[PDB]
């Protein structure tokens, strides 16, 4: 019927307007995420300064660290960072298949695999699945700004101090390019004595591979560009005075780095 055809065409036009506006909204959210990570850089950068000052001053032989000791892998804590929303292409499904592959690999090594579901789509996926081991379902409602980072920090702290779930590795999607991004696995715990992010098996230095991406436009369409300016720490006057033994002082410092890494990962996945 002519009325029905005109109605369905008005419906498709309404859908076109709704989605076209959602595109600009998502672009603005990308811009705010970019503006957040550049402001979060001072914390992690100054802490990398002070933290590689530490392995220059203590000469690396004065460490006995809870968050660095390697107890051989017997139970593993793989952290699944999944976006809360939907209609986001296949960003969720890509990592909810990467986790299946990674678990099917390490399921014979790490007999018990502990999935930590950060997000909302993962919290649906793992309750739909027949109960994969899940410690705390992390979801977001006023949490994702600061409380989420802090809560991940608390969970991994309590899980790592009683050293059963060693080799903690989190799964996220570093948005290298706007069109394509794949879910990486970065070993956050055991935290290395030097500030190099632990890749697969923890054997690769990832300070160079880590990048900050900002928005611009190649001649035709807007696209991200990879931008980095990074150096190594100076001595910063190693005559500096420690209020306690640097062992315990770095034991009190490593939760800060443990927090900052998780916050920047939750910004990258966002």
């Amino acid at each position: 019927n002519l009325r029905e055809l005109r109605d369905r065409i008005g419906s498709v036009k309404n859908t076109q307007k709704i989605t076209e506006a959602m595109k600009l909204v998502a672009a603005a959210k990308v811009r705010r995420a970019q503006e957040a990570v550049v402001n979060g850089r001072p914390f992690s950068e100054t802490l990398v300064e002070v933290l590689y000052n530490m392995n220059e001053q203590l000469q690396t032989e004065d460490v006995d660290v809870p968050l660095t000791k390697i107890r051989t892998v017997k139970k593993v804590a793989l952290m699944v960072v999944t976006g809360d929303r939907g209609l986001c292409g296949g960003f969720n499904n890509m990592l909810l298949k990467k986790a299946e592959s990674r678990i099917a690999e390490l399921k014979k090594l790490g007999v018990d695999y502990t999935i930590i579901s950060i997000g909302k789509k993962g919290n649906t996926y793992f309750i739909r699945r027949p109960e994969i081991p899940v410690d705390r379902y992390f979801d977001g409602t006023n949490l994702p700004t600061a409380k989420e980072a802090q809560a991940i920090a608390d969970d991994v702290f309590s899980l790592f101090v009683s050293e059963e779930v060693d080799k903690v590795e989190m799964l996220y999607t570093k948005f290298v390019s706007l069109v394509k991004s794949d879910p990486v696995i970065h070993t956050l715990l055991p935290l290395s004595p030097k500030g190099e992010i632990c890749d697969i098996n923890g054997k690769c230095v990832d300070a160079a591979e880590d990048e900050l991406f900002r928005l611009t436009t190649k001649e035709g369409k807007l696209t991200v560009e990879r931008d980095m300016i990074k150096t190594e720490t100076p001595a910063f006057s190693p005559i500096l005075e420690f209020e306690q033994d640097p062992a315990q002082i770095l034991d009190a410092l490593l939760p800060l780095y443990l927090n900052s890494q998780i916050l920047r990962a939750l910004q990258e996945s966002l």
Binding site: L2, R3, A21
Partner: protein
């Protein structure tokens, strides 16, 4: 049928100076079935007539009464037939309504738009509350200039989305009672002058204060 409607409609027009400057506005009505405005008699009357005031039942149900369709409606006479005060406020009003009509598909996303387009949504939202009128309650040109000025200047961002109608009716009555120079100014000159502009700003803020103390 086109010959019929053309003869009947074109019998009504503004006579010249010598013949007496008589005139005859034809305000015809056609009813359209299921929005088929390109049907035979609709396209005939739309072709013959100068303007078209298009009424929409989806606005009518939505509360926006009179339910005219502002993006579809046209008048090839235009601002020529407007009072000078009316055109001075109507330019700004039309620009604001064009802006909110563009931003209509961004009202759900009023949580993460820039505050500028947020405020354009706010202004157009109040302006929709402005244009609604009760049944068969006609306004005078001076009261309408009052209303469009209060809207276009930006004096309704404070009051919430519903009170706007009650606020504006109280505004018109308070101005009528306590600043009777405005209507006299516009009746004499038919031009929005800086004196009446200042007088209206004063009366507006006065009514706003007393209404807020309620």
């Amino acid at each position: 049928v086109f010959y019929l409607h053309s003869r009947l409609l074109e019998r009504a027009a503004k006579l010249s100076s010598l013949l007496g400057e008589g005139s005859m506005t034809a305000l015809p009505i056609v009813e359209t079935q299921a929005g088929d405005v390109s049907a035979y008699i609709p396209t005939n009357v739309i072709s013959i007539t100068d303007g078209q005031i298009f009424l929409s039942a989806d606005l009518f149900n939505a509360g926006i009464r009179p339910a005219i369709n502002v993006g579809i409606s046209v008048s090839r006479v235009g601002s020529a037939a407007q009072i000078k005060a009316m055109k001075k406020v109507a330019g700004k009003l039309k620009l604001e309504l064009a802006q909110f009509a563009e931003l209509e598909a961004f009202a759900q996303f009023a949580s993460d738009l820039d505050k500028a387009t947020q405020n354009q949504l706010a202004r157009g939202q109040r302006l929709r509350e402005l244009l609604k009128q009760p049944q068969s309650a006609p306004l005078t040109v001076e009261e309408q200039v009052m209303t469009i000025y209060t809207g276009t200047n930006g004096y309704l961002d404070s009051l919430e989305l519903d009170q706007v109608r009650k606020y504006l009716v109280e505004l018109r009555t308070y101005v009528k009672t306590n600043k009777p120079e405005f209507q006299e100014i516009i009746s004499s000159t038919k031009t929005f002058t800086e004196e009446a502009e200042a007088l209206l700003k004063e009366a507006i803020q006065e009514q706003m204060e007393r209404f807020l103390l309620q």
